[PDB]
């Protein structure tokens, strides 16, 4: 055993880190959705015949590394889970081109007064007040931002960690109230805790699926979506045709056509989109 004491003589911050070079993208950015039959195994329909019917239309550990045995091998990398937040058919597309929350209300609690839990809750939930984002509407979807709503019913769950490996939920950070209230404090108490503490229940790495890390040893990651409390849009095109217009001419592209739309990605990484041999950066 060797005993070492460390002490910081500077008052302010005397060291600064920065991302420089992306080596590779680990997670495949594809289409795989999260199956709630596997996350909530208890709940079921009354008829055994009808509950076994719906399971036919949808569908552990190994030496410390949790492995799924339904897939023999993967070619695009680690497979990304997707949730589904149901949403009215009349929610605006103009909400979707700018980074924001998947619930209809903005949840940045850093702006609020420090150590005031009632003022922070009133930003999230009450509808006497229009959004800190928008002054026109109070809420984009009342299915997720509302206090007893299906967003707040499904995904407000504090993680329970069964003996089975348990699986990661991307939506669960944007809806969980108590992990949002951790950022209600002053700025410099947040900046001190940004690099030192690993946040609540992130994904694993070098696995098949996205598993929530239950054994945090030497997992180094840092994630800026908890602090800034926004989610970055990607490519979406409601028909195959409008994805061709984005790659022919990027400037004179039309974001919304008569029936369909498109969302250009606004992300901190800007990838090379190459389909065919035409390249749009």
């Amino acid at each position: 055993t060797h005993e070492i004491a460390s002490l910081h003589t500077a008052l302010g911050y005397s060291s600064v880190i920065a991302p420089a070079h992306v080596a590779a993208i680990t997670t495949d950015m594809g289409v795989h959705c999260q199956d709630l039959f596997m996350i909530f195994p208890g709940d079921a329909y009354q008829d055994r015949q009808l509950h076994d019917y719906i399971k036919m239309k949808a569908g552990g550990y190994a030496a410390g590394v949790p492995r799924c045995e339904n897939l023999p091998g993967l070619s695009h990398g680690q497979l990304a889970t997707c949730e589904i937040i149901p949403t009215p058919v009349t929610s605006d597309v103009a909400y979707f081109q700018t980074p924001s929350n998947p619930r209809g209300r903005a949840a940045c609690v850093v702006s609020c007064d420090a150590y005031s839990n009632e003022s922070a809750e009133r930003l999230l939930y009450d509808h006497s007040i229009p959004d800190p984002a928008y002054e026109c509407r109070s809420t984009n979807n009342p299915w997720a931002s509302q206090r007893g709503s299906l967003g707040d019913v499904l995904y407000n769950i504090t993680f329970r960690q069964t003996a089975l490996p348990g699986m990661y939920s991307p939506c669960r950070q944007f809806f969980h109230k108590e992990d949002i209230m951790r950022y209600n404090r002053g700025l410099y108490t947040l900046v001190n805790e940004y690099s030192a503490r690993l946040a609540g229940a992130p994904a694993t790495s070098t696995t098949d699926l996205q598993y929530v890390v239950v054994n945090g040893t030497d997992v180094f990651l840092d994630q800026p979506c908890h602090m800034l409390q926004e989610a970055y849009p990607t490519l979406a095109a409601s028909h195959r045709v409008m994805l061709d217009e984005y790659m022919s001419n990027k400037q004179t592209h039309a974001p919304v056509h008569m029936g369909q739309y498109l969302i250009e990605e606004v992300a901190p990484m800007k990838r090379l989109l190459k389909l065919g041999n035409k390249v749009v950066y």
């Binding site: 600064v16 495949d28 990651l221 039309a254 029936g259």
Partner: protein, 393 residues
């Protein structure tokens, strides 16, 4: 058939003080840290004010007092010595094969004692780097906090929303800055204004700023160390010249011994000074002498003045007027099969619709699309582009 050769490794011994990372630290050898309960550094910041005769109520004198503490760290190791290895360490004066059976057993225990030291010399460079990475917030948070022009008035409610707006805009534009130098036409001048902006954001206000700890050849002043992996270091060394690649620094640690009058108060009372003797010469030997930077420098540089300066193999660089050493620690991590902490993973969340309507006065802008525009059509899927650019529904 016969053998041709027998080849093994000699383990590359890299200690803490030969690396350039000790430019970011101040090293003192402390004999009995098993006895210490706590550490303490006590600041007293006296803040001056402007007197002006407007309708203001003038401020009285202010004073801040700042307390700092140590943080303990414990390192482990492991040695497994065999049964018969210890057993035949004692009996001898047998046949000459039992000398070379004996001398092959002292070579086992000494190689198992190098390994107990090698696993502990890497432990310093691990824990010191892991202390630097905990007190290192990113650029996009600290850049718009390091300029006083945004928070002259104080952090009210309207300033904080105007800073969170700047955390997002600096995260989208200026992230992955060495990856963006390829596609920009300017290029090498963009990184140099990016990386000198990281340099000006760090708080340089260190207690030991006037202490002369590292120098270059010709007496220039090293200011800081930036640490990359091997892949990034190939980039920064080619864009910017390695002007000198040799620095001067101490050969050994600074000593601190509790001998003398420190030992009486350590035993009788529960406390002990650092440098009781120089601390005594201010209070009782020569009182009411105001503190002045020019002559008080010998008590700040306690020990670190007059250590034997030795040449250190390094790689320096010119950024503005400040010399910076550039390190890479993968040879100390890839040889032990532990993954490097500067190699790192960043998680993003990707927001995405499917299946919407558009309201009644439907419009278009596209010049060239012939098909879909009928009003009875409905879209029940959306297309995503993968990592490998394969579009999926």
């Amino acid at each position: 058939e016969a053998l041709l050769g027998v080849y093994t490794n000699v383990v590359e011994f890299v200690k803490f003080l030969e690396t350039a990372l000790a430019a970011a630290c101040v090293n003192t050898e402390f004999k009995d840290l098993r006895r210490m309960i706590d550490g303490k550094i006590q600041f007293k910041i006296s803040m001056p004010t402007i007197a002006h005769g407007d309708g203001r109520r003038p401020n009285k004198q202010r004073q801040y007092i700042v307390m700092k503490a140590c943080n303990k760290h414990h390192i482990g190791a492991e040695i497994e010595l065999a049964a018969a290895d210890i057993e035949l360490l004692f009996a001898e004066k047998e046949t000459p094969l039992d000398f070379t059976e004996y001398a092959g057993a002292i070579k086992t225990i000494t190689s198992a004692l190098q390994f107990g030291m090698d696993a502990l010399e890497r432990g310093l460079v691990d824990t010191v780097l892991a202390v630097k990475l905990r007190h290192a917030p990113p650029v996009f948070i600290l850049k718009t906090l390091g300029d006083p022009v945004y928070s002259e008035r104080g952090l009210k409610k309207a300033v904080k929303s105007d800073m969170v707006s700047m955390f997002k805009a600096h995260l989208i534009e200026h992230s992955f800055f060495l990856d963006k130098a390829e596609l920009m036409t300017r290029g090498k001048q963009y990184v140099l204004t990016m990386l000198s902006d990281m340099l000006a954001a760090v708080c340089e206000d260190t207690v030991f700023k006037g202490v002369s700890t590292y120098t270059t050849a010709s007496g220039q002043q090293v200011a800081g160390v930036l640490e990359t992996t091997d892949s990034v270091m190939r980039r920064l060394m080619n864009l910017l010249g390695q002007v000198e690649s040799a620095m001067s620094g101490p050969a050994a640690y600074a000593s601190y011994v509790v001998r003398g009058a420190n030992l009486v108060t350590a035993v009788s009372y529960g406390r002990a000074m650092r440098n009781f003797e120089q601390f005594m010469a201010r209070i009782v030997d020569h009182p009411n002498a105001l503190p002045s930077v020019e002559g008080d420098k010998a008590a700040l540089a306690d020990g670190h003045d007059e250590i034997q300066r030795t040449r250190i193999a390094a790689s320096l660089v010119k950024i503005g007027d400040k010399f910076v050493a550039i390190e890479s620690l993968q040879r100390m991590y890839n040889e032990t099969q532990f993954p490097c902490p500067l190699n790192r993973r960043i998680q993003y969340t990707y927001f995405f619709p499917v299946g919407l309507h558009l309201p009644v006065p439907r419009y278009s802008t596209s010049v060239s699309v012939r098909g879909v525009e009928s009003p009875a059509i409905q879209s029940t899927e959306t297309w995503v582009v993968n990592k490998n650019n394969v579009p999926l529904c």
